[PDB]
Amino acid sequence: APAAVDWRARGAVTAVKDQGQCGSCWAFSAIGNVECQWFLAGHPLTNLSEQMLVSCDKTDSGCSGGLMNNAFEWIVQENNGAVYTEDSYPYASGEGISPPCTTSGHTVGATITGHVELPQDEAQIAAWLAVNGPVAVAVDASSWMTYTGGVMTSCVSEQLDHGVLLVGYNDSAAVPYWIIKNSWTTQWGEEGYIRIAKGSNQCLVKEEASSAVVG
């Protein structure tokens, strides 16, 4: 695979968002992945709706957590593949309470047809990402609250408790790293991103990697 990849160089990644006090990391991870895959399929980069998932996907648990793979399945199996635009279904859970689902008044911004679940292998995830784009991953982010920059070598790696988005990597650095988009505003981390060491399953990053499929 290439020595380094960063899908921001393609303009494929939307701005960093703010999940607020809702436990909706799973939705930001899944939607961020869809946004990138939709762009990479040859469509304008579009902000898509986390709130659709948080409110409407009853296989996941709203502001009390969820799984990106469940979200992808809900979109295809219960929502006809459709993902509404953020503009037409804006986020309304920042205080920690998700409103009930509404089915009317929204605009379809993307469609997915399925999702892939990738091997539990950092090199194979990296190789897939190099060709096919950003990858949703579960991580242990329990130690991340005060991260301000650098390559996190120090990740607790005990329990998956967060979903984030791999957008690239750099295998050439002395400590190789993944490049991860978080959903805690651009005031956290490196303009809202984090680099974690790559190759030692830091933060359990290899355990639950997946991507939506467009087309």
Side-chain angles (χ1 to χ4, degrees):
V5 173
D6 186 341
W7 285 99
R8 296 174 293 181
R10 278 275 283 108
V13 187
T14 65
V16 169
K17 304 191 190 178
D18 183 4
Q19 71 187 75
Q21 301 302 296
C22 180
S24 51
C25 53
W26 60 276
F28 283 83
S29 174
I31 291 293
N33 166 262
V34 174
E35 288 171 338
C36 299
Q37 291 301 315
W38 180 250
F39 170 81
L40 289 175
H43 304 280
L45 187 66
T46 306
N47 284 322
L48 301 172
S49 173
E50 288 80 12
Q51 194 60 62
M52 176 196 71
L53 287 177
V54 175
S55 293
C56 302
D57 164 7
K58 303 304 181 179
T59 74
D60 289 301
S61 299
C63 289
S64 295
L67 296 174
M68 292 79 78
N69 286 332
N70 284 1
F72 297 139
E73 285 159 1
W74 180 88
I75 292 163
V76 173
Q77 297 168 4
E78 300 293 338
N79 216 48
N80 301 306
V83 182
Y84 296 123
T85 62
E86 183 164 9
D87 294 313
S88 78
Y89 205 154
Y91 196 60
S93 305
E95 303 84 3
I97 302 182
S98 178
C101 183
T102 55
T103 51
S104 303
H106 309 302
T107 299
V108 181
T111 294
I112 66 168
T113 57
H115 76 279
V116 298
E117 299 179 9
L118 296 178
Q120 300 180 312
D121 184 285
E122 288 184 87
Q124 292 174 46
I125 293 163
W128 192 99
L129 175 149
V131 171
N132 302 295
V135 172
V137 291
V139 295
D140 187 336
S142 66
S143 65
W144 285 19
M145 305 309 312
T146 56
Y147 171 80
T148 62
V151 174
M152 179 180 287
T153 56
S154 78
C155 207
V156 156
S157 319
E158 184 185 342
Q159 168 174 11
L160 298 178
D161 69 0
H162 190 47
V164 296
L165 186 71
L166 299 180
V167 302
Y169 63 88
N170 186 356
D171 281 334
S172 78
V175 177
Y177 57 84
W178 291 109
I179 303 170
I180 295 176
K181 187 190 191 190
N182 206 353
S183 50
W184 299 349
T185 86
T186 61
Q187 282 77 50
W188 179 86
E190 300 183 329
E191 307 306 336
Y193 286 75
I194 173 168
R195 288 179 293 151
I196 69 175
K198 177 170 176 296
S200 57
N201 200 28
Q202 287 304 308
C203 315
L204 309 179
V205 67
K206 84 186 189 180
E207 296 295 339
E208 193 170 7
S210 64
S211 181
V213 178
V214 173

